Amino acid sequence: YNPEFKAGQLLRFRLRVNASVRRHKRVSLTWDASSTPDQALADWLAAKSPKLGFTLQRCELLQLGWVYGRFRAALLEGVLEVDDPKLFLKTLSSGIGKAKSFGFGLLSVLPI
RNA sequence: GUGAACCGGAUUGCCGUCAGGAAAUUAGGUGCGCUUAGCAGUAUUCCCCACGCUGUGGG
């Protein structure tokens, strides 16, 4: 597999995220009663997307659940736009979160 | 080293010719497995390390 992508190229991506935050232990992401889980997850992913190297355009939640062995798993799909071709390759094949040993960090990018 | 010491029951042999267990039998009559439940709209994720007073890294 040799992924080559140019700057400013639209792609179709599927990614299962690990909503993990640290407080005063590691706890799952929690939203407010006036907001939907999809909005909170989209905002949380867009917060880290600058450092990752891609720009979110649209994203909807598909499967919000847990993975035992206890971890929190959320499956988000949509349309993303690559910012630069340098940081995107580093982000790929490395992970976008924690618990990478249980198959939580993985991207599948498709040309559109 | 004792009424003891020295000391072989040994050689020779086919149980062989013959035989239908056979004619006759239904195991049949009786039965609800039935009352019950989001793999998901959350308020601590089991343990370890570094960096701050939440963001990265491993299982």
Between CA A22 and CA A29 the distance in angstroms is: 9
Resolution in A: 2.5
Amino acid in the structure at residue A86: K
Q: Which nucleotides of B are covered by protein (CB under 7 A)?
A: 39-48, 52-59
**DSSP string covering chain A, please?**
------TT-EEEEEEEE--EEE---EEE----TTS-HHHHHHHHHHHHHHHHTEEEEEEEEEEEEEE---EEEEEEEEEEEES-TTHHHHHTTT-SSS-GGGT----EEEE-
| Cβ of A61 near strand B (distance < 7 A) | no
CA A16 / C1′ B13 distance in Å: 99
| Cβ of A97 near strand B (distance < 7 A) | yes
Between CA A45 and CA A17 the distance in angstroms is: 9
Between CA A34 and CA A106 the distance in angstroms is: 31
What experimental approach yielded this model? cryo-EM
| Cβ of A70 near strand B (distance < 7 A) | yes
**Token duo for residue A28:** 């799952």
